[PDB]
Enzyme design. Structure first.
Site, PDB file in Angstrom:
ATOM      1  N   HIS A  16      -2.273   2.806   6.662  1.00 29.20           N
ATOM      2  CA  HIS A  16      -1.678   3.866   7.328  1.00 29.20           C
ATOM      3  C   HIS A  16      -0.035   3.470   6.961  1.00 29.20           C
ATOM      4  CE1 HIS A  16      -4.623   3.394  10.250  1.00 29.20           C
ATOM      5  NE2 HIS A  16      -4.666   2.151  10.151  1.00 29.20           N
ATOM      6  N   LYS A  39     -13.024   9.574   7.131  1.00 32.76           N
ATOM      7  CA  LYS A  39     -13.307   9.411   8.249  1.00 32.76           C
ATOM      8  C   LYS A  39     -12.586  10.281   9.156  1.00 32.76           C
ATOM      9  CE  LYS A  39      -9.311   5.308  10.441  1.00 32.76           C
ATOM     10  NZ  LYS A  39      -8.909   4.800  10.093  1.00 32.76           N
ATOM     11  N   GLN A  41     -10.825  10.886  11.780  1.00 32.27           N
ATOM     12  CA  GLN A  41      -9.306  10.744  12.161  1.00 32.27           C
ATOM     13  C   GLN A  41      -8.405   9.729  12.023  1.00 32.27           C
ATOM     14  OE1 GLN A  41      -6.087   9.999  14.316  1.00 32.27           O
ATOM     15  NE2 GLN A  41      -7.134   7.524  14.845  1.00 32.27           N
ATOM     16  N   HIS A 130      -4.317  -3.880  11.727  1.00 35.09           N
ATOM     17  CA  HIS A 130      -5.323  -3.031  12.994  1.00 35.09           C
ATOM     18  C   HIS A 130      -4.278  -2.153  13.103  1.00 35.09           C
ATOM     19  CE1 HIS A 130      -7.604  -0.930  16.151  1.00 35.09           C
ATOM     20  NE2 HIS A 130      -8.112  -0.664  14.657  1.00 35.09           N
TER      21      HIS A 130
END
Length: 135
Positions: A16, A39, A41, A130
């Site tokens: 991220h 993955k 998205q 997360h």
């Protein structure tokens, strides 16, 4: 689901924070080559790891993705981000996975925990683990 060499915080950073190209197909190769699957998205936040750590200091709130968890924190401000969506699956040759990119400016909610005692650097006692939601 993460490769064993990374702590949750290091994997959060990989997925991220450290977009390695502004183009999704290229940036996603890193995530996909590590997790051995394309993955479907993934959101890259154009913010710094330090900025997310500071978001972990905002008030605890319920995680939208899991009503039973209270280790989530709202970003307060919006950030620019790129959202990648798989367009061309390729499970037997993950380098052939292609993605669309969607730019946006949104808030985010992140789950944070105490760091991995053995492997995370002591600099950051509390780390993001997360990406729960973008709003």
């Amino acid at each position: 689901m993460k490769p064993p060499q990374f702590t949750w915080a290091q994997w959060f950073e990989t997925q991220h924070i450290n977009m390695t190209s502004q183009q999704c197909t290229n940036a996603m190769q890193v995530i996909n080559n590590y997790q051995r699957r394309c993955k479907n998205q993934n959101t890259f936040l154009h913010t710094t790891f330090a900025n997310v750590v500071n978001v972990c200091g905002n008030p605890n709130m319920t995680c939208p993705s899991n009503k039973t968890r209270k280790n989530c924190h709202h970003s307060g401000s919006q950030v620019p981000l790129i959202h990648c969506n798989l367009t061309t699956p390729s499970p037997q040759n993950i380098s052939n996975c292609r993605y669309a990119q969607t730019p946006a400016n949104m808030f985010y909610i992140v789950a944070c925990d105490n760091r991995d005692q053995r492997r995370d650097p002591p600099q950051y006692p509390v780390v993001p683990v997360h990406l729960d939601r973008i709003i």
